[PDB]
Nucleic acid binder design. Sequence first.
RNA 1: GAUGGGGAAGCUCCGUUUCAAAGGCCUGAUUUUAUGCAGGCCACCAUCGAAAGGGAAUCCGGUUAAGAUUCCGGAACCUGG
RNA 2: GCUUGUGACGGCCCGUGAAAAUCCACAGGAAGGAAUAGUUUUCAUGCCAGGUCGUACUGAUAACCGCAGCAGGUCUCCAAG
RNA 3: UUUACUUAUUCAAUGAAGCGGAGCUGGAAUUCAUUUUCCACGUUCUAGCAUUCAAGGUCCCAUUCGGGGCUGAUCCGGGUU
Lengths: 252, 52, 121, 233
Amino acid sequence: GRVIRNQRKGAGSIFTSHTRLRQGAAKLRTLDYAERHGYIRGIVKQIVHDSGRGAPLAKVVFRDPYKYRLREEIFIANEGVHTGQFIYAGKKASLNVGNVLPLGSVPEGTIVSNVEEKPGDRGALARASGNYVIIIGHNPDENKTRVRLPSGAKKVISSDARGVIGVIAGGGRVDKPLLKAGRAFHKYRLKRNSWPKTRGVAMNPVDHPHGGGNHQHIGKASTISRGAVSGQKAGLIAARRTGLLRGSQKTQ
Amino acid sequence: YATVSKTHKTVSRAYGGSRCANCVKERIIRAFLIEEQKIVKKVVKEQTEAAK
Amino acid sequence: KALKVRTSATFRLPKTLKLARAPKYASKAVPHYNRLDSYKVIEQPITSETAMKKVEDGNILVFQVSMKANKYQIKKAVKELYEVDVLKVNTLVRPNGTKKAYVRLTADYDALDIANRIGYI
Amino acid sequence: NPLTHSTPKNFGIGQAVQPKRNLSRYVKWPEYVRVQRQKKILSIRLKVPPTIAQFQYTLDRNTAAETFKLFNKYRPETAAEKKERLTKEAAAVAEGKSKQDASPKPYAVKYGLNHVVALIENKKAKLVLIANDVDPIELVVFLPALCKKMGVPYAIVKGKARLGTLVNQKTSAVAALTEVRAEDEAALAKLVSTIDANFADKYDEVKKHWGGGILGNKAQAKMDKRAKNSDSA
RNA sequence: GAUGGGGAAGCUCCGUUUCAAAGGCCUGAUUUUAUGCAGGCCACCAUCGAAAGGGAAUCCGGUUAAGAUUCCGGAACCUGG
RNA sequence: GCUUGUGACGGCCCGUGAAAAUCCACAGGAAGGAAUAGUUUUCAUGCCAGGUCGUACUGAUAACCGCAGCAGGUCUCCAAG
RNA sequence: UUUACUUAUUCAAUGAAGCGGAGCUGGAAUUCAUUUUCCACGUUCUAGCAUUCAAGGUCCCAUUCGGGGCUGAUCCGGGUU
């Protein structure tokens, strides 16, 4: 009967919509002949800050070619542009600063925005692709593209996307310690809650399968197997290494 | 607004609703700038595919 | 036998025809009787000191309505009698079983001269 | 007149509003429409069953014309012109005491499709036709076999609705003649040599081979264009 | 918390638009036809859901054994037909 | 002096300050139109109509919720010298 | 392991939005007799501007302030990006 606080997401209450503060999504509108190989132009004016974190959002509203309507669509903005600057991204034209081109019509060094990973389709039924323009070099070989990130993974996919060049002031926010503390509730009153990460040498005594009793010491390995039991998964999963990464790089 | 007469809000004028201050002036000044450059891209810039 | 012109919205709902929808007989032959009449709405006028005050201070009559009524079933009831117009109808709520009502008149008719003529004194 | 110009007009796609064009598929198709277009195919898309392979073959309008007109003179009387006739023979058959005596012979054309028994064991089958739509798929794979074994001249035709009008119904079947008059005697034996030389000679050869090679759609707009560059670019 | 889908022997639950044939109006030919065939448009298309929030409109004074911004007297405004 | 309300700023934003209906305005100008007569139903003036339900006292150190005439718990408005 | 053609399953949008092959045509690249191949097919300095069966031609009830084809926007495919 006494469960652990890893098996909670099955009530639909304290895990539901908790983000009044925000507005809309970020996925683009209807795709046509324009928003792909040929000619695609974007806009950015009211750079309203992204609610919940540190990012900009723009009121990218396109005059619908199919019908006289200008539905307000809050999309992701970028840093470097002022209050109003149209995108100059033409496949049959050229390239400048802050443009939107597929991952095939551009050479190495192309950090676009995130929207989709599939050859376009207004939010591909998937998403296991890139997080946006954030991409270095590509691959001239056919329509394939080999991306790479310092996270430690590889991926080979297509070379078509609707991401625009631009940056977001996020670097430094996590590099600068939460000095003036008082952050946990309003911290992750954002979308849900996942910041209690939470201890007790005697949190649940006549139990602790890990190891505790009456003294600060564990017993069993906190490395719970992935395919073994879904009733003991409390702590590390599928361990391999453990060390200390120093600041001095200069490696191979 | 509907309770009061029409002659208490916009009694005349024209370009004055969603824009004001100096936006009423900018909607004509900048317009004349580009339209005068349209002629160039209709006879002068169309001399590329003239000598086939 | 070629390209049918459909340059509009998707032809969804068909174009039905309104047939002569008329019954061959009455739904229940004899319709329900009228539950509204002048000789059923009013009942027994309450004779008290509180009632007399609410008569000569605004030209209002005092009776006793049944239950379900509005500002017309009482108004039309008076007009059906001796043809008397009503300026304002007052309907109250009596949470016990019965109910009361007030009937206002015009500046032409008199409340005291119509009270001893309708029935009571 | 003096303001005569030329060249097509251009809208900036994002700018302006475009009007509806020649909508063909835009007016989205109904539910079972996307189903029926993939339902009744059989001999169009992929391969065909050797037991049939006759739905792709049709009859010319030069022979079928004389065939339909031949069955025009042979048809039972309708319900509107038969029930009233019973009152006319009241003083000739009923009160006349003459059961099937003072009456002309009703030369009716033969019929029957999925219910044929007495027309095989008694050898009373001549001209045999095949239905068009045929909803029961299981009731068509043994129709030519009911004529090939007995040597009955079967004719692979398409249609049974118009022939249902000369039978006082809606759908028809075969149309053989066992007791035909001398008026259309030469107009019946002439069609025998035609059917036997265009249908009876093609059964064993058709049974062996499967049947296919039919072009599809966009599929042949890339597959055939690939072999062209693979052999001689 | 439904219809149109998708499990189960029955009693039902979740989701709220996740393959639509969902809704039927302005005008032309028609006051006295309670409306049958063709163009040009609009993507909203079960409901319920706050007596501290949201919100076009009325206050003061006097009388009675009790209670009003409701009746009486005086002074005004808005919406729909 | 204190209390309440409003306009114009700064500081705070590692944690970034809901949703909907009605009314009004601007851009755009497609239909229908006048000399003993056309064109607004928007101002002024005048006339008519607008249901049902809810409704008082009290609301707490003699009135609700703890067998009871209990010293417990119990939201909100104006806040004197 | 295995390229194309797959009447069965699932499938984001769905107001099937301007698509692929083929097909009236340029330019770039060099020669074997011609188009047997590869980029073409409405915005790209500025919240200044943009729509109403597109501004223009031919064919009709006649001199009408409107309306009805084709071209503009040719097909196949009905598996539209």
